[PDB]
Design an enzyme around this catalytic site. Structure first.
Site, mmCIF file in Angstrom:
data_model
loop_
_atom_site.group_PDB
_atom_site.id
_atom_site.type_symbol
_atom_site.label_atom_id
_atom_site.label_comp_id
_atom_site.label_asym_id
_atom_site.label_seq_id
_atom_site.Cartn_x
_atom_site.Cartn_y
_atom_site.Cartn_z
ATOM 1 N N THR A 189 -25.486 -28.425 -4.381
ATOM 2 C CA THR A 189 -24.732 -29.560 -4.894
ATOM 3 C C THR A 189 -23.402 -29.087 -5.464
ATOM 4 O O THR A 189 -22.617 -29.877 -5.960
ATOM 5 C CB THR A 189 -25.516 -30.307 -5.971
ATOM 6 O OG1 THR A 189 -25.696 -29.427 -7.085
ATOM 7 C CG2 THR A 189 -26.914 -30.785 -5.452
ATOM 8 N N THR A 190 -23.164 -27.782 -5.405
ATOM 9 C CA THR A 190 -21.903 -27.212 -5.830
ATOM 10 C C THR A 190 -21.293 -26.424 -4.678
ATOM 11 O O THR A 190 -22.022 -25.878 -3.832
ATOM 12 C CB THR A 190 -22.068 -26.278 -7.049
ATOM 13 O OG1 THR A 190 -22.862 -25.160 -6.672
ATOM 14 C CG2 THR A 190 -22.731 -26.983 -8.200
ATOM 15 N N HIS A 234 -18.778 -23.552 -14.860
ATOM 16 C CA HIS A 234 -19.292 -24.831 -14.291
ATOM 17 C C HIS A 234 -20.611 -25.257 -14.942
ATOM 18 O O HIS A 234 -20.868 -26.447 -15.160
ATOM 19 C CB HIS A 234 -19.501 -24.712 -12.773
ATOM 20 C CG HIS A 234 -18.369 -24.038 -12.070
ATOM 21 N ND1 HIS A 234 -17.228 -24.711 -11.680
ATOM 22 C CD2 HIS A 234 -18.184 -22.745 -11.720
ATOM 23 C CE1 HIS A 234 -16.395 -23.856 -11.109
ATOM 24 N NE2 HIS A 234 -16.953 -22.658 -11.122
ATOM 25 N N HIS A 253 -30.352 -23.269 -13.759
ATOM 26 C CA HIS A 253 -29.224 -23.855 -14.442
ATOM 27 C C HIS A 253 -29.513 -25.345 -14.570
ATOM 28 O O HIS A 253 -30.498 -25.847 -14.009
ATOM 29 C CB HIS A 253 -27.934 -23.649 -13.641
ATOM 30 C CG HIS A 253 -27.981 -24.279 -12.291
ATOM 31 N ND1 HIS A 253 -28.419 -23.603 -11.171
ATOM 32 C CD2 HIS A 253 -27.712 -25.544 -11.890
ATOM 33 C CE1 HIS A 253 -28.390 -24.422 -10.132
ATOM 34 N NE2 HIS A 253 -27.956 -25.604 -10.540
ATOM 35 N N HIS A 308 -27.513 -29.464 -14.919
ATOM 36 C CA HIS A 308 -26.384 -30.381 -14.900
ATOM 37 C C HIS A 308 -26.699 -31.464 -15.927
ATOM 38 O O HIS A 308 -27.838 -31.936 -15.999
ATOM 39 C CB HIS A 308 -26.269 -31.017 -13.518
ATOM 40 C CG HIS A 308 -26.275 -30.016 -12.406
ATOM 41 N ND1 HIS A 308 -25.116 -29.540 -11.832
ATOM 42 C CD2 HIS A 308 -27.294 -29.376 -11.789
ATOM 43 C CE1 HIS A 308 -25.422 -28.669 -10.888
ATOM 44 N NE2 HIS A 308 -26.737 -28.541 -10.848
HETATM 45 ZN ZN LIG Z 1 -27.729 -27.284 -9.637
#
Ligand SMILES: [Zn+2]
Ligand SMILES: [Hg+2]
Length: 256
Positions: A195-196, A61, A91, A93
């Site tokens: 948000t995941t 992801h 991480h 996005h």
């Molecule tokens: Zn995130």
């Protein structure tokens, strides 16, 4: 399983994760003219001097830079936060083009990417217990725009060739997350969620106003990553972002 495409994308997540349609979901649009300066906000403290990175992992992801959180080495406190929150991972996005990729938006404006530095409330003993709590997590969101290169990001960019596909990891010690911070720590804050999936509503969000700039060539390497695992058809790891969710009965506070 859940992903970002037409058939397993964020519009589908509610079917496995009903809290997708909950009362404090992230990300949201930050309406700068509705957000209120909060004078009771204590100064924000980001202490990354003793941060110990361990490895980088492609989880199908995004990629996670993981940290040794068995001690208070990299901590977040102050601002809206009560007590100490410990850095576990970061991480990003990002988008397929520069005009999209951020999760949070500012006055409907989408950045090319957004960095999330994920911290857990040390009051709760471990990450797993903290994600059972309304105030278990603190995520520091930082926007990326494309402009000049970001020197303290390049060690990340260069390791990506080695973790191209789902489940690949590489060693990644002595990475300094201070190299990813903008000059200003001005921020907006609100209560939200991951948000995941599983979209747990446990997060105090701290979104910095000042973005960091990265180069076109840095963001391009991000885009060479794969959603799929080794030996499968190539799905470029892009557009791994959830769109803005209903604000509902929530207030975004400004630190400035
Ligand atoms: Zn995130
Ligand atoms: Hg929670």
């Amino acid at each position: 399983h859940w992903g970002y495409g037409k058939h397993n994308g964020p519009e589908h997540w509610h079917k496995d994760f009903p809290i997708a349609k909950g009362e404090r979901q992230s990300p949201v649009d930050i309406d700068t003219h509705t957000a209120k300066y909060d004078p009771s906000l204590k100064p924000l403290s980001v202490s990354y001097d003793q941060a110990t990175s361990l490895r980088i992992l492609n989880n199908g992801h995004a990629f996670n830079v993981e940290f040794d959180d068995s001690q208070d080495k990299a901590v977040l406190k102050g601002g809206p936060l009560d007590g100490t929150y410990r850095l576990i991972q970061f991480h990003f996005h990002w988008g397929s083009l520069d005009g999209q990729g951020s999760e949070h938006t500012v006055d409907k404006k989408k950045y090319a990417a957004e960095l999330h530095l994920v911290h857990w409330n040390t009051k709760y003993g471990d990450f797993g217990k903290a994600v059972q709590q309304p105030d278990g997590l603190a995520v520091l969101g930082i926007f990326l725009k494309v402009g000049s290169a970001k020197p303290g990001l390049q060690k990340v960019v260069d390791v990506l060739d080695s973790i191209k596909t789902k489940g690949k990891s590489a060693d990644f010690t002595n990475f300094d997350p201070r190299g990813l911070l903008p000059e200003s720590l001005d921020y907006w804050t609100y209560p939200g969620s991951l948000t995941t999936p599983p979209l747990l509503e446990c997060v105090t969000w701290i979104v910095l106003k000042e973005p960091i700039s990265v180069s076109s060539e840095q963001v391009l390497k991000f885009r060479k990553l794969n959603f799929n695992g080794e030996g499968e058809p190539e799905e470029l790891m892009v557009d791994n972002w959830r769109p803005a969710q209903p604000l509902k009965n929530r207030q975004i506070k400004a630190s400035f």
